[PDB]
Structures are given as structure tokens and as C-alpha cells.
Amino acid sequence: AAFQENVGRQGTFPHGIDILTTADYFAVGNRSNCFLVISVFIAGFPEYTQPMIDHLVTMKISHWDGVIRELAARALHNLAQQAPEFSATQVFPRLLSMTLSPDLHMRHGSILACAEVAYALYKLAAQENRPVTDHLDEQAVQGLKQIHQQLYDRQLYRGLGGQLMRQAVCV
């Protein structure tokens, strides 16, 4: 409602009509649509690609609920095909440093985000008869080959908290 008011009374919001016709009182009702469908439509423009992904990576992925974390991971996956360079150069390394944090939920969210980014980059490269290593530089290949090994070095797979790390490593 605030966005609609700002677009109707000021008309200075970039792509106000588009983000107002797709996101309305009815379409916004669904959370899955807002996190996967409407999200990609709103991020299609260059004025909402960086901040949206930044907020998804520095907040939603580190939520206190597994459902919200999975939703943020799926949103990042869907928004990883509108920004391959930004997802493979500024967000992927950003996640490699957070996968080693002491927090359990943060580690799980970072692992999920890294897996989703890798899957999206592979899907994008498959549509151009090119390998996935082109987008994921040697830096990415190293960290990804160190997620499971480092976790076992800190007996992090033990306990209830270790069960979520085991599931994340399996995924």
C-alpha cells in the first residue's frame, strides 16, 4: 500500500506501474509467489538486482526458521539467472566466508545459498554448451571442495546441531 501511494502521489519510483500492477492486494497475498515469482519480475530491472540479493544474503538466508531459510535460498536460486556475474563474483565469495562462521543457522543458510548458486550457474552454462567451471573460478572450486572436509575437522556433525550440518552437506 505504501508503494502504491508513493507511485500514485509522486511518480518518482523507478518502474512504479510495473511493480504496482504485478504486486497488488491479491498477488502479494501469497508468500511463495512474492519470494519466487514476483521477486524475479521485480529484480529484472537493474535498479533492484543488487539490493535485493544483498538483503537476501545478509538477512533472509540467516533467518531463525528453516522454512524462511529455504524460501530465501529458492529466491536466490530463481534470482541467480538474472545476474550470473554478480552471483558468481560478489555473492558466492561472500557466502564462502560465512559458511565457516560459528553460528549454526548462518552456516546452514550459507551452505544452502552456495549450493543454489552453483546449481543456477550450472543450469545457465548448460544452455550455452559451456562448462560450469567458467563461472565458478578456481577460488569457488576450492571453497566448495572444502565445505564437507572442514566441517568434519571440528566434529561439527555431532549432536542435534550437527544433524542440520549433515543435511546441508548432503544437499
Binding site: 491479491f26 497475498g29 501469497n30 508468500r31 511463495s32
Partner: protein
């Protein structure tokens, strides 16, 4: 643990809540003004379990009237005992929820839960040690179901270790004529099994059949339904309002009547059956009361105890009588009707006696059972739910408010798995 906060959502819940308060006040001698005027010390030995002491030796209730519209909120405040409650304990909106669970659980309810959790923490702050909660709502109405189940979840998320007890009133097509009540009922169950600890099943079809066939009434009204619901509430809580060793607190009652986490639905019963403006001079004996309390006709649910197996049974006899005779009658009933009792939970029938019979009756009897036959109350709901959900009828009301078919699928699955578990436990070691 010595103070219990009372809550009531929806019109039926508020009405059922106001009737129970009036009954326990008339039984304790608390006149509408708030001063004690009874004639027994036991009435004051356990008065702090539901009331609060205030200047002038007054007993202020500890309830919280909650609604989304103002009708029921004005009806209770203006009732014969309406002045008893607190003026700042009435929290309601203006539009209602229109028989929609979504509107009452995600919009108006989600907005008024803030103020609701303000009065709730106000009552918990005036409690030396909170013991639990006792909500009174219905599973048919939208506001009564949605926002009330939203208050159970909020309390379970806030207060970590506190017992949760509710008096769910299952609707019935015979009373109401609204089509979206099957959906408003199923979803509620999906919450209770995963939120509430104790829940009493008060089917409306059973009350209608008892009022139309037993009490002889051509047009049973909502005044007759509240006359049977309040008596049941006064009978099932007689142990918490007076001295006792069996179930003095809510934790003990839960531990004794909840053999499994998901299985905690107790069908209540009370005898002798009476109606408004009727005085039975004949005083039934103890054997007659024990035989009538176990009869399916005196059950508040539409389930026959004979077509099932008992798990936990608790009987209470209110009236001047002998304990040896009651014990002998209970032993005889357990021996004769032994096939209707699981043999894998030894000593699963408790009996208690009280020296404070209800008003207008010299001899009363109560029955809180945990038989697997209660599953029948859900199977009926299942048929309606499935029949209405397969063709997609009136579904836009839910999907258009944030909900989706996934929730209905989840609730249907949870309810269906609760029926299978009941059937399995009923045939344990067959």
C-alpha cells in the same frame, strides 16, 4: 502454580465463558457485586485459583473477553453478572472475521493479538505462579476458531512451560446452516494436536439430540446449548475449584488423562440431565447415577463408548453420600464392563467424591473419558471436508487471504493420521 487465566474467543466461546463464570460464582457464593456470601469454608479454601483479591476483600475475576466485533462484548458486560469483570479486559474490533479462518487467523486476529497479549501478560503479572490456561472457543466460527488458535500458538511460543487446556465446541449441521464450517473445523484440529495439551469434545449434534429426544423440546435454542455446556464445565473443573488429592492442579490432570502427546481429546458427561426451569425432586441413588453417567445418551459427544476402548477415565460424585458405596459401585462397573477397558494401562479408572453438589441438585455425577471412540467425531468431519474440497467450492475465500491448498492438505493428512493412530491403539495386541 496457583493461578489460572481464563480466555474466551468468539460469540459462543464468550457466552459459554460467561455462563461458567456465573455458575462457579453462584456455587461459591460470590454475588454479582463480588463479596463472599456462601456458607462453607471450602468455597474460600480454593478461591485464589480463579479470582484475585482486591481492596475491601473483593474477588475480581481473572478472565479476558476477546472478540473481533462488539455484539457479544456488550451482551456479556450487560448480563446479570457483567459488572464482575474488568473494564480493560474486553479487547475487540468492529468487522468480525465473516466465518473465514484466514480472516480471523492472519488479518484481524493477527492485528488484535498484540492487544490480546497485553491483557494476558497483565493477568500473568498478577499471578504468584501461573499454572496454565483455559480457553473457551468453537471450531466452527471463523473468529472463534482462527484468532483463538492464533492465541494458543502465541502462548505456547511465549510461555515455555505452561499447560494448555481448551473447551472446543464442534459445530453441527443441525444447529447452523453455514457451508464453510467443515474447513473452519478441520484446520483447527491440525493446530490442537500440535499446540493444545488437553481438549474437551463438546459436539453440537449430541446436545441437539439430548435436547430434542431426552428433554423433549420442539425447538431447542442456543439458551439450551449453553445450559448443557456450562454444567459440563462446572463438573469437569470441580476438582480445581475445591480441595482434592486426585486432580488438584492442571499438570496432574494432564499427566493422568494424556497417555500420548497427540491423543488428548476427552469426551465429558454429566448426570442427571436437566433443563432450564425444571426441578427434579427425586434423588437418584449412587448405583443409578453410576449407570447413567456411563450411558451414551448422557455423553456430550456423538460417540458411543461401547463402540471403543477406554484409556483414562475420571469420575466425580458431588453430593452427600458414602465413599465405600461409590468405590464398590466403581469396582463392580469395572469388573462387569471390563471388555470396554484396555488392559495395558493398569489402574486407569479414578474416582473422587466432593461435599459440594451443584445448585438445584442434591446428587450429581461427572465423567471425563479418553476412549478411542472419540475418533468417530472426526471421521464425520473428514467426509464433509473431502466432499467439499475435491470440487473446489468457496476456496477463493482462503487462497485470497494468504492460505493455500497445502495447508488444507497438511491439516487433512494430520487429522487422517490421528484417526489411524486411534484405530491402532484401540486394537493394541489384537
Amino acid at each position: 502454580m496457583r493461578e489460572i487465566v481464563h480466555i474466551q474467543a468468539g460469540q459462543c466461546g464468550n457466552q459459554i465463558g460467561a455462563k461458567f463464570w456465573e455458575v462457579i460464582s453462584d456455587e461459591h457464593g460470590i454475588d454479582p457485586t463480588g463479596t463472599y456470601h456462601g456458607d462453607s469454608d471450602l468455597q474460600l479454601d480454593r478461591i485464589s485459583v480463579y479470582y484475585n483479591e482486591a481492596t475491601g476483600g473483593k474477588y475480581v475475576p481473572r478472565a479476558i473477553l476477546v472478540d473481533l466485533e462488539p455484539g457479544t462484548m456488550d451482551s456479556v458486560r450487560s448480563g446479570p453478572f457483567g459488572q464482575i469483570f474488568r473494564p480493560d479486559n474486553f479487547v475487540f474490533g468492529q468487522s468480525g472475521a465473516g466465518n473465514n479462518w484466514a480472516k480471523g487467523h492472519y488479518t484481524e486476529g493477527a492485528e488484535l493479538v498484540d492487544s490480546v497479549l497485553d491483557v494476558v501478560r497483565k493477568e500473568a503479572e498478577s499471578c504468584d505462579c501461573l499454572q496454565g490456561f483455559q480457553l473457551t472457543h468453537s471450531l466452527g466460527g471463523g473468529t472463534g476458531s482462527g484468532m483463538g488458535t492464533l492465541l494458543i500458538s502465541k502462548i505456547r511460543e511465549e510461555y515455555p512451560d505452561r499447560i494448555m487446556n481448551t473447551f472446543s465446541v464442534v459445530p453441527s449441521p443441525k444447529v447452523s446452516d453455514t457451508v464453510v464450517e467443515p474447513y473452519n473445523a478441520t484446520l483447527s484440529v491440525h493446530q490442537l494436536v500440535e499446540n493444545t495439551d488437553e481438549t474437551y469434545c463438546i459436539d453440537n449434534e449430541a446436545l441437539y439430540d439430548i435436547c430434542f429426544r431426552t428433554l423433549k423440546l420442539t425447538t431447542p435454542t442456543y439458551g439450551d446449548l449453553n445450559h448443557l455446556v456450562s454444567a459440563t464445565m462446572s463438573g469437569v473443573t470441580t476438582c480445581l475449584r475445591f480441595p482434592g488429592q486426585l486432580n488438584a492442579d492442571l499438570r496432574k490432570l494432564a499427566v493422568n488423562m494424556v497417555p500420548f502427546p497427540r491423543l488428548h481429546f476427552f469426551m465429558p458427561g454429566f448426570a442427571p440431565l436437566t433443563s432450564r426451569g425444571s426441578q427434579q425432586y427425586r434423588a437418584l441413588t449412587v448405583p443409578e447415577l453410576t449407570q447413567q453417567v456411563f450411558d451414551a445418551k448422557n455423553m456430550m459427544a456423538a460417540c458411543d463408548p461401547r463402540h471403543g476402548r477406554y484409556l483414562t477415565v475420571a469420575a466425580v460424585f458431588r453430593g452427600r453420600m458414602s465413599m465405600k458405596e461409590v468405590d464398590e459401585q466403581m469396582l463392580n462397573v469395572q469388573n462387569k464392563n471390563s471388555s470396554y477397558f484396555v488392559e495395558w494401562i493398569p489402574n486407569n479408572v479414578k474416582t473422587a467424591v466432593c461435599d459440594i453438589p451443584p445448585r438445584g441438585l442434591k446428587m450429581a455425577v461427572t465423567f471425563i473419558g479418553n476412549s478411542t471412540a472419540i475418533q468417530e467425531l472426526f471421521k464425520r468431519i473428514s467426509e464433509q471436508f473431502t466432499a467439499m474440497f475435491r470440487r473446489k467450492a468457496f476456496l477463493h475465500w482462503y487462497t485470497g487471504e494468504g492460505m493455500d491448498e497445502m495447508e488444507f492438505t497438511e491439516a487433512e493428512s494430520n487429522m487422517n493420521d490421528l484417526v489411524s493412530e486411534y484405530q491402532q491403539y484401540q486394537d493394541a495386541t489384537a
